[PDB]
């Protein structure tokens, strides 16, 4: 009863890049058990922000992926009290971000906090100079490991000139008190830019999340 088929959320984050300090603030909702969901974002310090939205915005929702009934949910089982993920993103030309990220549920709502560190990304790379144009489709590598779920993607972010830009990125995933720990499996995510404000200061987003079995 706990996860309902309709959530809303609340995010904050707290974050630098290259120095650059800035906070957002935003919500959102979908629809966990189809694994759906969009959000509304603002930038609330340090805008409007001098690099490229879309290394923020994979940081913005574990529990709105669609699990299919043999691959135990431990991001959706870890609830009421939650689960917390720490993330390290290398990137193709040296930049550098680290993530960690709280997530609990409060008066029907999942409440998340967010702490992001950007670093050595190029003063004339695609993002200190904003030459990025959103995602391709990913999925993330998932498997279980000391007790945790780990989670390894090679992300693709589209050049305004064409070609691609890469990171790779591995993060780990913990639920605050142990629940089942599923096998290994994938996640297949697209995550799209909606709507935003010529300066990026006010940002919509969606995503669609799947898990897929890897064997069987």
Do not use: C
Not at 26 to 39: D, F, I, K
Not at 102 to 108: I, N, P, Y
Request: charged residues 30%; negative net charge.
């Amino acid at each position: 009863a706990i996860i309902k088929e309709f959530m809303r959320f609340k995010v904050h984050m707290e974050g630098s890049v290259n120095g650059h300090e800035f906070e957002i603030e935003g919500e959102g909702e979908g629809r966990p058990y189809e694994g759906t969901q969009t959000a509304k974002l603002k930038v609330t310090k340090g805008g409007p922000l001098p690099f490229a939205w879309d290394i923020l915005s994979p940081q913005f929702s574990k529990a709105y992926v669609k699990h299919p009934a043999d691959i135990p949910d431990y991001l959706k089982l870890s609830f009421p009290e939650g689960f917390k993920w720490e993330r390290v993103m290398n990137f193709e030309d040296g930049g550098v971000v680290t993530v960690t990220q709280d997530s609990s549920l409060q008066d029907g709502e999942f409440i998340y906090k967010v702490k992001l560190r950007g670093t050595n990304f190029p003063s004339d790379g695609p993002v200190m100079q904003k030459k990025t144009m959103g995602f391709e489709a990913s999925s993330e590598r998932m498997y279980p490991e000391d007790g945790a779920l780990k989670g390894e993607i090679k992300q693709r972010l589209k050049l305004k000139d064409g070609g691609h830009y890469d990171a790779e990125v591995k993060t780990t995933y913990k639920a605050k008190k142990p629940v089942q720990l599923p096998g290994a499996y994938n996640v297949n995510i697209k995550l799209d830019i909606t709507s935003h404000n010529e300066d990026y200061t006010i940002v919509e987003q969606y995503e669609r999340a799947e898990g897929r079995h890897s064997t069987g």
